[PDB]
Curated annotation (Swiss-Prot):
Protein name (database record): Uridine diphosphate glucose pyrophosphatase NUDT22
Effect seen on changing E181A: Abolishes enzyme activity with UDP-galactose
UniProt key word Protein biosynthesis: no
Known role: Hydrolyzes UDP-glucose to glucose 1-phosphate and UMP and UDP-galactose to galactose 1-phosphate and UMP. Preferred substrate is UDP-glucose.
Motif window: Nudix box: 163-184
Annotated residues for binding of substrate: F55, Y86, R138, A143, D150, H155, E157, S262
Swiss-Prot/TrEMBL catalytic activity: UDP-sugar + H2O = UMP + alpha-D-aldose 1-phosphate
Gene Ontology CC terms, in alphabetical order: nucleoplasm
Keywords: Hydrolase, Magnesium, Metal-binding
Needed co-factor(s): Mg(2+)
GO MF, one annotated term: UDP-sugar diphosphatase activity
Organism: Homo sapiens (Human)
Effect caused by changing H155A: Abolishes enzyme activity with UDP-galactose
Amino-acid positions noted as binding Mg(2+) in the UniProt annotation, renumbered to this chain: E177, E181
Amino acid sequence: DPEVTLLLQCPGGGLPQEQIQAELSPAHDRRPLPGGDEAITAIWETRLKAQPWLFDAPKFRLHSATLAPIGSRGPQLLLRLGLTSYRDFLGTNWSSSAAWLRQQGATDWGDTQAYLADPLGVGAALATADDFLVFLRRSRQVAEAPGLVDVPGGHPEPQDLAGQLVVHELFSSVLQEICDEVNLPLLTLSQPLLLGIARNETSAGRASAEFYVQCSLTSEQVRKHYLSGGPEAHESTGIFFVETQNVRRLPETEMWAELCPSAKGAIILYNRVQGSPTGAALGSPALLPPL
Ligand SMILES: CS(=O)(=O)Nc1ccc(C(N)=O)cc1
């Protein structure tokens, strides 16, 4: 699967908020473009002259993530974060010359991402009480991945001492994205666990944090809540459910070619981190069928 690369797989079946540190520093920001940031301003001006209702918004930028030695006490992950914006994304990762910026970053900084906005996404493997994962169909009229299958998520907007507030906003934002798009009550959702980080190589390597969330409602109750909002309550055009039993072999199905890269990342990390049992009981042939 060339359109997705794993940057991080979390240990212990996934990390809770209390085990993650963030360092938010201007040292983690995008580098100014070789010919000046005027090229981003020019793309933005041109876009507003066709769509004058568009607005900019701040975003978190992922610089890097370091995992502690496995089995250790204390914080298990450090996230190095800077700040970016929707405007900087449209002028870099979304630009037709994004591959040229990646090559110049390798040359100048030894870092393919140095000249890229790289806004941080969040996504969820959302499981129902009757053991299904939740999937959403994208509109065929949108600019990125039209008509493809997605999972719930988004790109969080800002507002270990500033750090712990940033980790809280990341975990908070995946729950808020589930409530806004699936129309679920917040009290039906578990605290999220971080499964890992995946990169979208079709969007010049931008990364998404992928989380596991468990809902106390059944698939039928989740569908009712989603539909009861009506067409204006969601950006997606449909919802559907796959048994967790069948998610194991999803990359061998015709569904796999319809999944957007960030949803592929969520399902690969769910299979590696929540699936794949390590012990004798769940490992037994009747419970883990070979092939
Ligand atoms: C049309 S989209 O599928 O919502 N794609 C996006 C990609 C990046 C950003 C960002 N973090 O600036 C926001 C949205």
